[PDB]
């Protein structure tokens, strides 16, 4: 994995030794080269994972998350270079250093063979994200946002640490490859009940679980654009990755420990999607849509069938691309009208038609239009939850109504109707902005041609 870790670290002298006019160009270029390099992780086998060393491995779960992570860094640099144009040069380099450091922590979060090293990289991701939100977020509430993001995580993750160390004392190892063969069944007891909660609640916070989700519509809203891109696209998926690894050790107790959380997710995706119908802040609407989409990934991981894991990893990759694009579109309107109020700037298709086409494609992927990988993940989770219980289709199908309703309402409010008369600073779309939208949307649509690389380890 060290052929990816070392160039990601070499981005640090690359950004700190660059000429002052070259720090976006150089980091964008070489992060795109690292992202091109990331496709060598697609040496996956039908039986074995790609096991590099004692410290690092990559199966078909971690590989698309790695490719998406390494792809998101150039797009974050493109998204962030405009609103940091007037910034001090050293603070600009510190911002890029926090993004590079976050990429470095993420790529060895997903490839960590041993679970306590997964824990340390998983929690190490908090510090650059907290710094990016509280230092380069725009408003006052970022400070409060930085507290919620910090303290819902750690209150969930410090019982995980203890739990993992307990497994270290019980199994003798936290190697996931060893734990594939030495896993013992976890019977019904109170000790194993709180073992289950300590193993699961940190990832439940990261997803987020409904009812634990309150950090997200502050953290993703108050963040700068690169912060929101990495929070929605990658850091939510640390929870899903960690659940898919940790539920190996939690059988068969999961078969009744999942029942409350499944309810919290199945009703929660009804709630948060409904919340999106009455959001006045566009970026808050995109955040609540992320909570609603990750509720399906929670249900799919908890019912733990092959179809549900395939749907959940497809939905994680698809939601990463779609939610990152939606935050970038909302930012492209924020960088013109300087307000996140969705009803403010209307009729934007009359003024910005190609950006309206990007809004259309991102809305269509948000509502899971076939054959997008959004629909592939959505549909496969719906198949597996119908097999779990046939009544879930009600809460599934009603969700797909509301998901359509808030996706097009967002599209109707901002793009359609009459333009606002008094707003006259709607600049034509920059090449950087359309480029950012296309670098989200074109890989997302090309993955429909060959979705087997985003279907995870039990494709």
């Amino acid at each position: 994995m060290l052929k990816y870790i070392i160039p990601t670290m070499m981005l640090m002298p690359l950004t700190w030794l660059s000429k002052n006019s070259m720090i976006w160009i150089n980091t964008t270029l070489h992060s795109l080269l690292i992202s091109l390099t990331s496709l060598l992780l697609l040496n996956q086998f039908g039986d074995n994972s790609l096991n590099f060393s004692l410290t690092f491995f990559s199966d078909s779960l971690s590989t698309p998350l790695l490719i998406l992570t390494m792809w998101l860094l150039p797009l974050m640099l493109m998204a962030s270079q405009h609103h940091l144009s007037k910034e001090n040069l050293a603070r600009k380099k510190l911002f890029i250093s926090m993004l590079i450091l976050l990429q470095l922590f993420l790529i060895m979060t997903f490839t960590a063979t041993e679970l306590i090293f997964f824990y340390i990289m998983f929690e190490a991701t908090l510090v650059p994200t907290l710094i990016i939100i509280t230092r380069w977020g725009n408003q006052t509430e970022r400070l409060n946002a930085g507290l919620y993001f910090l303290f819902y995580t750690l209150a969930g993750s410090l019982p995980l640490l203890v739990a993992l160390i307990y497994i270290q004392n019980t199994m003798g190892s936290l190697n996931f490859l060893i734990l594939q063969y030495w896993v013992q069944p976890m019977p019904n007891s109170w000790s194993n009940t709180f073992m289950w909660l300590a193993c699961m609640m940190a990832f439940m916070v990261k997803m987020p679980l409904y009812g634990l989700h309150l950090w997200l519509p502050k953290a993703h809203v108050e963040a700068p654009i690169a912060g929101s891109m990495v929070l929605a696209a990658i850091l939510l998926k640390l929870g899903g990755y960690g659940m898919m690894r940790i539920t190996l050790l939690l059988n068969p107790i999961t078969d009744f420990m999942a029942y409350p959380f499944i309810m919290l997710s199945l009703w929660g995706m009804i709630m948060t999607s409904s919340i999106c119908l009455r959001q006045t802040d566009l970026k808050s609407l995109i955040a609540y849509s992320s909570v609603s989409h990750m509720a399906l990934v929670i249900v799919a991981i908890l019912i733990q069938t092959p179809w549900s894991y395939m749907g959940a990893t497809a939905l994680m990759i698809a939601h990463g691309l779609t939610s990152s694009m939606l935050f970038c579109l909302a930012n492209s309107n924020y960088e013109r009208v300087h307000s996140r109020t969705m009803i403010l700037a209307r009729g934007l298709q009359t003024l910005l038609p190609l950006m309206a086409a990007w809004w259309l494609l991102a809305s269509l992927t948000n509502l899971a239009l076939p054959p997008s990988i959004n629909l592939i993940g959505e549909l496969f989770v719906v198949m597996s939850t119908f097999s779990w219980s046939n009544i879930t289709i009600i809460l599934m199908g009603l969700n797909m109504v509301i998901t359509a309703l808030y996706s097009l309402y967002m599209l109707i409010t901002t793009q359609r109707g009459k333009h606002t008369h008094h707003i006259n600073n709607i600049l034509p779309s920059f090449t950087r902005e359309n480029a950012l939208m296309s670098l989200h949307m074109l890989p997302l649509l090309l993955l429909s041609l060959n979705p087997k690389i985003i279907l995870g380890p039990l494709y």
Binding site: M9, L11, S18, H30
Partner: protein
Amino acid sequence: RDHWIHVLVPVGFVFGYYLDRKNDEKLAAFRNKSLLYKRELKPQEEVTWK
């Protein structure tokens, strides 16, 4: 070199790639010893993989 900064990330790839290959020789205890893939060595061959 006038563009010496554009080799930091590529050489950091190559060196990183190098270390990965250098790690494989430290994990070669079961080279040509698995029950699936053990075989007799071909002529002018000393290892089955490097």
